[PDB]
Amino acid sequence: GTVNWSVEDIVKGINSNNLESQLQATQAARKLLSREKQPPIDNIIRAGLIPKFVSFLGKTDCSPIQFESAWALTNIASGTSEQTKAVVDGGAIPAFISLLASPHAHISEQAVWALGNIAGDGSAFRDLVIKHGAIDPLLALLAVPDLSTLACGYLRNLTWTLSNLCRNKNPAPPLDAVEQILPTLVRLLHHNDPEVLADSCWAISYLTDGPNERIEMVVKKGVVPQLVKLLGATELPIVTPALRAIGNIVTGTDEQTQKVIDAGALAVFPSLLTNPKTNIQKEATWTMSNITAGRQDQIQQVVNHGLVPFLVGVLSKADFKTQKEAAWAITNYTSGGTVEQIVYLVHCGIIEPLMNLLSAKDTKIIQVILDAISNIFQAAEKLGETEKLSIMIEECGGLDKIEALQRHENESVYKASLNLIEKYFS
């Protein structure tokens, strides 16, 4: 009969001098806080119950009240930043870290969960959890010869909490903390549970979202081939973070991008660039745009894998944001590519969709497309085929679009368009 208690009754029980009455009331609070219909978190906080729960976390010889208070506090910490803050202000971080070593698995797991919510609030609470020394006991829980001997839910909660310890920026997690976490993270990235894999990929995607030194920390552990494998996974919750991480990595140096290419990533992009999930297509086209910004041999690898027709396709038809990413990929390709590669791009049919996209209201995409067209015209000049390109552009209706752009609000736009008209359409 710990169901549908009032906050007043919970308070009466917790303020009793009776450990069992306190346990009953704490379980009643846990049940109140574990309902999907507007859990009365703020009422529980206003009642002043957080410090009592925290003190209960330390009652070693009453493991039930440890568990019930840990669960109640976990659900409080799962709410707004102010509610998580109320939990932290009650002294919960060191108590939960001390619980991580509990001989009862459900209590240690609940402490893992609570620390995950706290760390996931933001960079400050993440770093505060780290300062209290959570990483060592967390990783100690995972120091087993074979991860398959752990309970599935326990392992999933550990992975999610570690991922939250890798999450958030301004600042990014401490470098020493990342180095301490990464080996276990790679081990988890090779685990066979789909949720563990998804959360490990999210962690890696966080760690690779930053300067090239962070990307290097990750790539040095040799995870790129496993990331490409997971990029081939059937589960969207795995592919999404895998692709996000690969994109992050190819925002780095040409050597890191080359590690992505060598692992076989481009072979997956025919499907990714046609994926029915809009976000997958957009992220894959963004990754392609940063690969085409690389060296000429890397552009050539893009060509060899047959991805230029897929870029033409996405430019021809896709969500407008994906089309913007595709236009950027084309501009990078044309800015860095050889004359032969640019000619090949034209032979694949880039001109007509590129010109069709010059009717968009977005100014940035117009600038991008005009720069790409200028680069293609420069290649044609180097081949002395500018007249052929001008005729092609005129046949698809692009000359009309550029002439109209000559009188466009933005400045760079009309300047570039007038330059094109004067230089190649006289």
């Binding site: 574990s34 799962s78 709410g79 919510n117 996931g120 609030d121 780095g252 940063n290 800015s335």
Partner: peptide
């Protein structure tokens, strides 16, 4: 050229 560009309750 290159462009750099949670919580869970129980029950």
């Amino acid at each position: 050229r290159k462009i750099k560009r949670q919580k869970r309750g129980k029950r």
